[PDB]
Amino acid sequence: GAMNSSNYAELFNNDIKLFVDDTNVYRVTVHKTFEGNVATKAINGCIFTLNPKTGHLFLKIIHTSVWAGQKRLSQLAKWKTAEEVSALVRSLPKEEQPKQIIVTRKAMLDPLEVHMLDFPNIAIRPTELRLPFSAAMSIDKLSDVVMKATEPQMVLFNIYDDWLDRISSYTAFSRLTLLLRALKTNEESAKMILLSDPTITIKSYHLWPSFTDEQWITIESQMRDLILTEYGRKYNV
Amino acid sequence: MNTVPFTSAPIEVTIGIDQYSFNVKENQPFHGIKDIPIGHVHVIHFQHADNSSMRYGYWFDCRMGNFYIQYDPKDGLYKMMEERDGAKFENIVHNFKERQMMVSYPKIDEDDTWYNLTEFVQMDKIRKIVRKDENQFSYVDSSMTTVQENELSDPAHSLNYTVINFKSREAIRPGHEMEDFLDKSYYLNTVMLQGIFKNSSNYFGELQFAFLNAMFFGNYGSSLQWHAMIELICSSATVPKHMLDKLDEILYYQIKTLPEQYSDILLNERVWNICLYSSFQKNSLHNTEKIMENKYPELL
Ligand SMILES: O=C(COc1cccc(F)c1)NC1CC1
């Protein structure tokens, strides 16, 4: 059924699974109109679909043109998410199709289940984890490809860069969620932490900087601090 | 007017005939039920004094043969039978009526309740839901499961209601996933009405039969089926106007007749609130919404 702390190691077994986060699919800026009314303007979005074991990220970019002339866009966005995830699964060879899809928001369950009626062996699951995947657009290179897109487009990334050469997927996911939590709680501090030192670069083919093992521990500690911090500043503790 | 005579009444039992019921005491001189209105299906049902577990009963139509009840001390229940010999039936029944050992079906002449609950119920269709083809009458009890319930174990003792499942390839057209899940008109009108039921009368008749099995036997799967068939209409943007008008009448009399003390288990809060307040047809069930709100405002 639902996914929580009791079964956190299931993510890193050998059953193919994908997380799907739809929080950045329908994005808007809200503004005043000349008549003093309020209007929205949509901007490009993305479906964040991620294999937590391999780090493979199927970033489906949602171009604003898909909303043209449509009604109830927050609701359409969920079904559009489901449609595009269903399309991805169908494009993958059978031995690459997930055995489970885990949705980060419960409102995605019915839209995805309906789109995947053709795949009755694929389990559609919620989670009780509060995962920070909405902060994916704080990753500069992901944000860049979404905002530059002029048409619908799937871009493939490895959100772990080369980390799996040195650490396990359990540790790689925990780093990723720590980084994304930090970016979500205080993006500027998080980004300052990551890029303060000019001598640690981000390789062209990577998303994150080329930290050594020792540097990652310092970074990880600095991001923990940030998250405990902002939690004070928030709750005055 | 027709008669369901009894051999005797050897065990204390509450007997129901349609929406009426009376207590018969162990070995009381009871020999059946008379003046039963022709033209309607009927149900005669039982709840033993000793074991309130298992309400059970027999759907039947007096036009389809002469029926008598004889308790079976081996199987432990009141069984419906057919007397092949028409002459013996008249001779035994007349004997019983002269000695006044029968209760009279007690219909008030103003009262259309039973008609209104059974308007579209036909014995021929009942027998396709309750498969026991050697008998003209159909047995139902509390514990009988439905075909869909056995998909989620004895196939012969099942209620073969039409399977309705909103998240099914039957209900959802490829490429219309969102359209068809949020507006079930395709499933109601094309799949179910045009495809399976053929007309709204068959649809309504199953719906009414499901309700009556739920109310009379506390048959849980019947209750599920009645609610599903309401929801399938309420969740369709496009429903013929006469079907909605009739549905409002149907439900009105069902809600009117439900025992007040059983509303907590026969009425599904989620379905009713959705149908009355959120669904496409939220404004289309004036009579039903009015009785529901004056009789069971708690549910809403
Ligand atoms: O028992 C009966 C008939 O029993 C009846 C028939 C008609 C009305 C009635 F009250 C009782 N036939 C053969 C012996 C088994």
Q: How far is the C-alpha of A136 from the C-alpha of A124, rounded, in Å?
A: 22
Contact list, B168 vs chain A (CB under 8 Å): 117
Beta carbons of A114 and B181 less than 8 Å apart: yes
Contacts of A188 by beta carbon, 8 Å cutoff, 6+ apart: none
Residue B77 near residue B143, CB atoms below 8 Å? no
Q: How many CA atoms lie within 13 A of A1 on its CB side?
A: 3
Q: Which of A79, A113, A118 sits opposite B178 (nearest CB)?
A: A79
Q: How far is the C-alpha of B91 from the C-alpha of B228, rounded, in Å?
A: 47
Question: Which residues are registered as beta bridge partners of B17?
Answer: B20, B44
Q: How far is the C-alpha of B164 from the C-alpha of B192, rounded, in Å?
A: 9
Whether B68 lines ligand 1, by a CB cut-off of 6 Å, is: yes
B178 to chain A: closest CA residue: A79
The token pair that represents B45 in the structure block = 């049902």
Distance (angstroms) between ligand 1 centre and the Cα of B83 equals 6
Beta carbons of A114 and B169 less than 8 Å apart: no
Instruction: Report in angstroms the alpha-carbon separations of B60 from B15, B23, B63, B136, B158.
Output: 15, 21, 9, 7, 18
Q: How many CA atoms lie within 13 A of B244 on its CB side?
A: 20
Neighbours of A78 (CB within 10 A): 21
Report CA torsion sign: B102, B103, B109, B115: negative
Q: How far is the C-alpha of B9 from the C-alpha of A226, rounded, in Å?
A: 82
Which fold, B116-299?
1.25.40
To test the pocket of ligand 1, the residue of B2, B34, B70 to mutate (highest count of ligand atoms within 8 Å of its CB) is B70
Nearest-CA residue for atom 9 of ligand 1: B7
B182 to chain A: closest CA residue: A111
Which A positions 49-78 lie with beta carbon below 8 A of chain B?
Answer: 76
The H or E element spanning position A95 is none
Resolution (in Å) of the shown entry? Answer: 1.7
* Strand order through the sheet with A123-125: A123-125, A100-103, A17-21, A45-50, A56-62, A153-158
Structure letter (DSSP) for residue A203: P
- Show the CA angle centred on residue A56, arms to residues A54 and A61, nearest 5°: 165
Q: How far is the C-alpha of B225 from the C-alpha of B148, rounded, in Å?
A: 10
Q: How far is the C-alpha of B276 from the C-alpha of B254, rounded, in Å?
A: 15
Q: How far is the C-alpha of B121 from the C-alpha of B179, rounded, in Å?
A: 33
Q: How far is the C-alpha of B17 from the C-alpha of B105, rounded, in Å?
A: 8
Residue A142 near residue A157, CB atoms below 8 Å? yes
Per DSSP, the three-state class of A52 is: coil
Nearest CA to A117 out of B166, B162, B237, B148 is that of B166
The three state secondary structure string of B134-171 is CCCCEEEECCCCECCHHHCCCHHHCECCCCCCCCCCCC
Per DSSP, the three-state class of B59 is: strand
The token pair that represents B295 in the structure block = 């009789």
Neighbours of A60 (CB within 10 A): 22
Which fold, A9-163?
Nucleotidyltransferase; domain 5 (3.30.420)
* Chain A nearest CA to B174, separation (Å): 8
Q: How far is the C-alpha of A223 from the C-alpha of A225, rounded, in Å?
A: 5
Type of residue found at B188? L
Residue B280 near residue B235, CB atoms below 8 Å? yes
Expt. technique: X-ray
CATH 1.10.10.10 fits A164-237, yes or no: no
- Check if A119 contacts B (Cβ < 8 Å): no
Residue B204 near residue B117, CB atoms below 8 Å? no
Residue A109 near residue A103, CB atoms below 8 Å? yes
Domain ranges of chain A: 9-163, 164-237
